[PDB]
C-alpha cells in the first residue's frame, strides 16, 4: 500500500520520542492507529477489536518496571497486524515433477487473463515448465487477448475461436498438455457472478471435468462491501484454497481483503500493483508487516542476492584491487541488474528511507531507457570490451564511434555519455582498489579496521548524491545498515 | 530523474558488493584519530626522546702526586 504503513509508522513514532509514556500516551497513539485502519476500509467493529486486543496484550498497570515498554508496545501491534492478515492455514505449493493444475475464478474485469500470464511467467522464470489454457467463451476477444499476452510471454497456450462449450475445450486442453508431461497447467475461466445460475453451474461442471489441484479466486482491490457476499458464496460451491489480490494501485487499497481472510481462512499468495505482466510481487506475511513498521526484510534481499549466485568472487577481487574495470564487466553488472527483478522491490525491502520512493510513472520507462545501454554496448567488439580503459582507446580512433553508431541508433551523444559514465565508474573502482584491503581472499584479515572502513565510508559518501545521504542516516546510519546486511 | 536513477544504481551496487565481497565491518567507534595522530605521536615521541639526562661525575683514574 505504501501509504497505510507510513501513517502507522508515524503512529509508532508518536508513541516513542517522549520524555514519558503513561496510560494516556497509549490511547493517544492508538487513535492514530485506528484512524489509519478506518481509512483502509476496515470494519469499525474489527478496529475496535484490534484496539482491545493490543490493550490486553500490553497492560501498563502492573507491568514490571525496568523492562523495555516501547519495545514491547511496538511489537504488540506488529503481532496484531500480522495476525489480522494471517489466516493460520498453510498455503498450497506445487511439487516438482508432478502435473499440477490450477483453476482461476473471479468476477468480470478482475484480471484473470493477466493473472494467468503473470503466474505463468513467474514460474517460468523460477524454472518451471508451464502452459496456458483459455476456457473463455463469453467475453468477446478473450482468446485473442490471451494469445497476444502469451506470445508476449513466450508461454504455450491452447484455445479455439469456434468452440462455445468451455468444459470440453478446458478438458481437452488439459488432456493434450498432460501427454507431454507439463508441470503447471493454469486454466482461464470467464467472468461470473453469483446472481447468474447458468454460469454458476458451468463452474461446477468445469471444476468436476478438470479436477484442479488448487482453486484460486481473483479479487480486485477496488471493490467495496460486495466482496464478502460473493466470496463466501463462491467458496460454498468450489474448494477455494488461495486468493490473489490485484489492482493494488487503486484508491480502495483492498480493505475488504482482511474480512475475506477472516472469512475464508486462506492466505494471499501474490499481489499485483501494475497492469504490466512483469509487475508481480509476493505477499509473504511477516515481511509485509515488517515493511509497515520501518523494519524492512533482510532475509528476502539476501535470498534474492543468493538467487543471483555470482559464479566467482576471487578473480573479481584481485582484478578490482589492481584497478581494472572493463566494459564487459560493466555489461555483466547491467545483466545482473536486469536479472535482479523489479527495481522498486529492491529498495522497498531495505529499512531505509521508505518503500514509496520508486514512482511507477517515470522509473518504469527509466528501466527501458537503461535497457538501451546494453544495445549500445553490444556494438563493441572483444577488443573494446576487454580493454583496460575504454576512454583512452575511444579518444584515439573516432571511427569506432561511427562503427558503434552503425549497429545502434544515432548514439553520437549516447556513446559519449556512456563513456563518461564508464570513466566515472572506472575512477570509483580505482579508488575502491586503492582502499588497500577491504575485500575477502588472500590473507586472513577477516576483521576490518575502523580506520580503513572510515576512509572507505568517506570515499563512498562523497560520490553517491546529495539529499539522499542526509536522509539515509549519515555515516553511522550507513555503516549500521551495512552491518545489518552483513549479519542478515 | 537521472540523478534518482543513478542513486538507485549506486545503492544496489553497494549492497551487492558488500554481500559478495567485503568482510566484517565495525559499526562505528568514533573513527580513530590515527590518520593525523600518527604525525602527532611522531612529534610526541620527539618530545619523549628529549627527556632530560641527569648529570654525572666524570671518572678519571689519575696516577700519583709528587714529593
Ligand atoms: N491497475 C491495475 N489494473 C489491472 C491489474 N491487473 C489487471 N488490470 C486490469 O484488468 C483488465 C483486464 O481484466 P480481464 O482479464 O479482462 O478480467 P476478466 O474479464 O474477468 O478475465 C486490464 O484492462 C487491466 O487494466 C493491476 O495489477 N493493476
From chain B, the residues in CB contact with A482 under 8 A are 14, 18, 22, 25
Cell digits of residue A135:
476456457
From chain B, the residues in CB contact with A350 under 8 A are 11, 15
Are A281 and A272 a contacting pair, CB within 8 Å? yes
Are A194 and A105 a contacting pair, CB within 8 Å? no
For residue A106, report the phi and psi dihedrals to the nearest 5 degrees: 165, 180
* Residue A87, number of CB atoms within 10 A of its CB: 18
List all residues of chain B from 19 to 38 with a beta carbon under 8 Å from chain A: 19-29, 31-32, 34-35
Gap between the Cα atoms of A153 and A26, Å rounded: 51
The H or E element spanning position A376 is helix A360-377
Cell digits of residue A196:
447468474
- Strands in A130-135's sheet, in edge-to-edge order, are A157-158, A130-135, A184-189, A100-106, A214-220, A240-246, A268-272, A281-282
Burial of A243 (0-12, 13-18, 19+ CB in 10 A): buried
Q: List, in sequence order, every residue forming a beta bridge with A244; answer none if it has no partner.
A: A218
Gap between the Cα atoms of A42 and A324, Å rounded: 57
- Residue whose C-alpha cell is 559514465: A421
- Enter the DSSP assignment of B35: G
Known binding residues of A for GTP are 106-113, 188-192, 246-249
For residue A378, report the phi and psi dihedrals to the nearest 5 degrees: -70, -15
Q: Is the CB of A299 under 6 A from ligand 1?
A: no
Closest atom of ligand 1 to A218 CA is: 20
Gap between the Cα atoms of A116 and A102, Å rounded: 10
Gap between the Cα atoms of A440 and A455, Å rounded: 17
Give residue A211 CA to ligand 1 midpoint distance, Å: 26
Q: Which residues contact A395 (CB under 8 A, 6 or more apart)?
A: none
Strand bridging mode A268-272 / A281-282: antiparallel
Q: How far is CA A88 from the centre of its chain?
A: 23
Q: Is the CB of A39 under 6 A from ligand 1?
A: no
Among B21, B27, B29, the residue with its CB nearest the CB of A317 is B21
Sign of the CA dihedral A370, A374, A377, A382? positive
Gap between the Cα atoms of A141 and A199, Å rounded: 19
Cell digits of residue A417:
555519455
Give residue A190 CA to ligand 1 midpoint distance, Å: 13
* Residue A236, number of CB atoms within 10 A of its CB: 9
Give residue A110 CA to ligand 1 midpoint distance, Å: 6
For A12, A187, A429, A454, the CA distances from A58, given in Å and listed in that order, are 14, 48, 52, 42
Cell digits of residue A213:
489441484
Q: Is the CB of A191 under 6 A from ligand 1?
A: yes
Q: Among A103, A106, A107, A109, name the best residue to mutate to test ligand 1's pocket (greatest count of ligand atoms within 8 A of Cβ).
A: A109
**HSE on the CB side for A326, CA within 13 Å?**
15
Gap between the Cα atoms of A304 and A121, Å rounded: 17
List all residues of chain A from 243 to 302 with a beta carbon under 8 Å from chain B: 301-302
Gap between the Cα atoms of A108 and A207, Å rounded: 18
Are A116 and A104 a contacting pair, CB within 8 Å? yes
Burial of A190 (0-12, 13-18, 19+ CB in 10 A): buried
* Residue identifier of the C-alpha nearest atom 21 of ligand 1: A112
For A101, A112, A125, A376, the CA distances from A150, given in Å and listed in that order, are 18, 13, 14, 29
Are A174 and A210 a contacting pair, CB within 8 Å? yes
DSSP string, A102-143: EEEEE-TTS-HHHHHHHHHHHHHHHT--EEEEEE--SSTTHH
**Of A82, A65, A74, residue with least CA distance to A15:** A74
Q: How far is CA A161 from the centre of its chain?
A: 35
Gap between the Cα atoms of A195 and A229, Å rounded: 11
Quick check: B24 and A450 CB within 8 A?
A: no
Gap between the Cα atoms of B27 and B24, Å rounded: 10
Q: How far is CA A305 from the centre of its chain?
A: 14
Strand bridging mode A130-135 / A184-189: parallel
Cell digits of residue A12:
509508532
Gap between the Cα atoms of A253 and A248, Å rounded: 6
List all residues of chain A from 22 to 81 with a beta carbon under 8 Å from chain B: none
For A13, A26, A69, A75, A251, the CA distances from A18, given in Å and listed in that order, are 9, 12, 12, 18, 34
From chain A, the residues in CB contact with B33 under 8 A are none
Are A405 and A411 a contacting pair, CB within 8 Å? yes
CA–CA min distance B36, chain A (Å)? 11
Exposure pattern of B5-44 as b/e (b: 16+ CB <10 Å)? Answer: bebbbbbbbbbbebbbbbeebbebeebeeeeeeeeeeeee
* Residue identifier of the C-alpha nearest atom 9 of ligand 1: A111
Q: For chains A and B, what is the number of CB pairs under 8 angstroms? A: 103
CA–CA min distance A340, chain B (Å)? 10
| Coil, strand or helix at A349 | coil
Are A280 and A252 a contacting pair, CB within 8 Å? no
Sign of the CA dihedral A124, A205, A264, A255? positive
Touching check for A447 and chain B: CB below 8 Å? yes
Quick check: A451 and B16 CB within 8 A?
A: no
For A117, A120, A124, A149, the CA distances from A276, given in Å and listed in that order, are 10, 14, 16, 10
User: Which own/partner pairs from A156-164 qualify as long-range (CB within 8 Å, at least 24 positions apart)?
Assistant: A156/A130, A156/A131, A156/A132, A156/A182, A157/A131, A157/A132, A157/A133, A158/A131, A158/A132, A158/A133, A158/A134, A159/A133, A159/A134, A159/A135, A163/A137, A164/A137
For residue B24, report the phi and psi dihedrals to the nearest 5 degrees: -55, 135
Give residue A363 CA to ligand 1 midpoint distance, Å: 22
For A20, A56, A78, A361, B28, the CA distances from A24, given in Å and listed in that order, are 10, 15, 20, 43, 37
Cell digits of residue A107:
468476477
| Coil, strand or helix at A154 | coil
List all residues of chain A from 78 to 137 with a beta carbon under 8 Å from chain B: none
Gap between the Cα atoms of A230 and A90, Å rounded: 23
In chain B the first and final C-alpha atoms are separated, in Å, by: 110
* Residue identifier of the C-alpha nearest atom 15 of ligand 1: A111
Are A436 and A452 a contacting pair, CB within 8 Å? yes
Gap between the Cα atoms of A231 and A215, Å rounded: 13
Closest atom of ligand 1 to A249 CA is: 1
Are A104 and A113 a contacting pair, CB within 8 Å? no
- Residue whose C-alpha cell is 568482510: B23
Give residue A263 CA to ligand 1 midpoint distance, Å: 25
Among A366, A451, A485, the residue with its CB nearest the CB of B1 is A366
Which residue in B has a C-alpha nearest to residue A480's C-alpha? Answer: B27
For residue A215, report the phi and psi dihedrals to the nearest 5 degrees: -105, 125
Helices in A130-226 by DSSP H: which ranges?
A: 142-152, 166-179, 197-210
For residue A179, report the phi and psi dihedrals to the nearest 5 degrees: -70, -40
Touching check for A460 and chain B: CB below 8 Å? yes
Are A266 and A240 a contacting pair, CB within 8 Å? yes
Q: Which residues contact A476 (CB under 8 A, 6 or more apart)?
A: B27, B28
| Coil, strand or helix at A247 | coil
For residue A192, report the phi and psi dihedrals to the nearest 5 degrees: -155, 145
User: Which own/partner pairs from A434-441 qualify as long-range (CB within 8 Å, at least 24 positions apart)?
Assistant: A434/A323, A435/A459, A438/B22, A438/B23, A439/A317, A439/A320, A439/A321, A439/B21, A439/B22, A439/B23, A440/A313, A440/A317, A440/B21, A440/B22, A440/B23, A441/A313, A441/A314, A441/A317, A441/A318
Strand bridging mode A214-220 / A240-246: parallel
Q: List, in sequence order, every residue forming a beta bridge with A102; answer none if it has no partner.
A: A186, A214
List all residues of chain A from 469 to 488 with a beta carbon under 8 Å from chain B: 475-476, 479-480, 482-483, 485-486
List all residues of chain A from 297 to 356 with a beta carbon under 8 Å from chain B: 301-302, 305, 308, 310, 313, 316-317, 333, 336-337, 340, 343, 346-347, 350
**HSE on the CB side for B37, CA within 13 Å?**
5
Gap between the Cα atoms of A299 and A305, Å rounded: 10
Among A337, A363, A486, the residue with its CB nearest the CB of B25 is A486
Cell digits of residue A235:
467458496
Cell digits of residue A143:
482468446
**Of A469, A297, A486, A429, residue with least CA distance to B26:** A486
Amino acid at each position: 500500500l505504501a501509504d497505510l504503513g507510513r501513517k502507522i509508522t508515524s503512529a509508532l513514532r508518536s508513541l516513542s520520542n517522549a520524555t514519558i509514556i503513561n496510560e494516556e500516551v497509549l490511547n493517544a497513539m492508538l487513535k492514530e492507529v485506528c484512524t489509519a485502519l478506518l481509512e483502509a476500509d476496515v470494519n469499525i467493529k474489527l478496529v475496535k477489536q484490534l484496539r482491545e486486543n493490543v490493550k490486553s496484550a500490553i497492560d501498563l498497570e502492573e507491568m514490571a518496571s525496568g523492562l523495555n515498554k516501547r519495545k514491547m508496545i511496538q511489537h504488540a501491534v506488529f503481532k496484531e497486524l500480522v495476525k489480522l492478515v494471517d489466516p493460520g492455514v498453510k498455503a498450497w505449493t506445487p511439487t516438482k515433477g508432478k502435473q499440477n493444475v490450477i483453476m482461476f475464478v473471479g468476477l468480470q474485469g478482475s484480471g484473470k487473463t493477466t493473472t494467468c500470464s503473470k503466474l505463468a511467467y513467474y514460474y517460468q522464470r523460477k524454472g518451471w515448465k508451464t502452459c496456458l489454457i483459455c476456457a473463455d467463451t463469453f467475453r468477446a476477444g478473450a482468446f485473442d487477448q490471451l494469445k497476444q499476452n502469451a506470445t508476449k510471454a513466450r508461454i504455450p497456450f491452447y484455445g479455439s475461436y469456434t468452440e462455445m462449450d468451455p468444459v470440453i475445450i478446458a478438458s481437452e486442453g488439459v488432456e493434450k498438455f498432460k501427454n507431454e508431461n507439463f508441470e503447471i497447467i493454469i486454466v482461464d475461466t470467464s467472468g461470473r457472478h453469483k446472481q447468474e445460475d447458468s454460469l454458476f453451474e458451468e463452474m461446477l461442471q468445469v471444476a468436476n471435468a478438470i479436477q484442479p489441484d488448487n482453486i484460486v479466486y481473483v479479487m480486485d482491490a477496488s471493490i467495496g462491501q460486495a466482496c464478502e457476499a460473493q466470496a463466501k458464496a463462491f467458496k460454498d460451491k468450489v474448494d477455494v484454497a488461495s486468493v490473489i489480490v490485484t489492482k493494488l494501485d487503486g484508491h480502495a487499497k483492498g480493505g475488504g481483503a482482511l474480512s475475506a481472510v477472516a472469512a475464508t481462512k486462506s492466505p494471499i499468495i501474490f499481489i499485483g500493483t501494475g497492469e504490466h505482466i512483469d509487475d508481480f510481487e509476493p505477499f509473504k506475511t511477516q515481511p509485509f508487516i515488517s515493511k509497515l513498521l520501518g523494519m524492512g526484510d533482510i532475509e528476502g534481499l539476501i535470498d534474492k542476492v543468493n538467487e543471483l549466485k555470482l559464479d566467482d568472487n576471487e578473480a573479481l577481487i584481485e582484478k578490482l584491487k589492481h584497478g581494472q574495470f572493463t566494459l564487459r564487466d560493466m555489461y555483466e553488472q547491467f545483466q545482473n541488474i536486469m536479472k535482479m527483478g523489479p527495481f522498486s522491490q529492491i529498495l522497498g525491502m531495505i529499512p531505509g528511507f521508505g518503500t514509496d520512493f520508486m514512482s511507477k510513472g517515470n522509473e518504469q520507462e527509466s528501466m527501458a531507457r537503461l535497457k538501451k545501454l546494453m544495445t549500445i554496448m553490444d556494438s563493441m567488439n572483444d577488443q573494446e570490451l576487454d580493454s583496460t580503459d575504454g576512454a583512452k582507446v575511444f579518444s584515439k580512433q573516432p571511427g569506432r564511434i561511427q562503427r558503434v553508431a552503425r549497429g545502434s541508433g544515432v548514439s553520437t551523444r549516447d556513446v559519449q555519455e556512456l563513456l563518461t559514465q564508464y570513466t566515472k565508474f572506472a575512477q570509483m573502482v580505482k579508488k575502491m582498489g586503492g582502499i588497500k584491503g577491504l575485500f575477502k581472499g588472500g590473507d586472513m584479515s577477516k576483521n576490518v579496521s575502523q580506520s580503513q572502513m572510515a576512509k572507505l565510508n568517506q570515499q563512498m559518501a562523497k560520490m553517491m548524491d546529495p539529499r539522499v545521504l542526509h536522509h539515509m542516516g549519515g555515516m553511522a546510519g550507513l555503516q549500521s545498515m551495512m552491518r545489518q546486511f552483513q549479519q542478515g | 530523474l537521472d540523478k534518482l536513477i543513478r542513486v538507485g544504481i549506486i545503492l544496489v551496487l553497494l549492497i551487492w558488493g558488500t554481500v559478495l565481497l567485503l568482510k566484517s565491518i565495525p559499526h562505528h567507534s568514533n573513527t580513530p584519530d590515527y590518520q593525523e595522530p600518527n604525525s602527532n605521536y611522531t612529534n610526541d615521541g620527539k618530545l619523549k626522546v628529549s627527556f632530560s639526562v641527569v648529570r654525572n661525575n666524570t671518572f678519571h683514574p689519575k696516577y700519583h702526586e709528587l714529593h
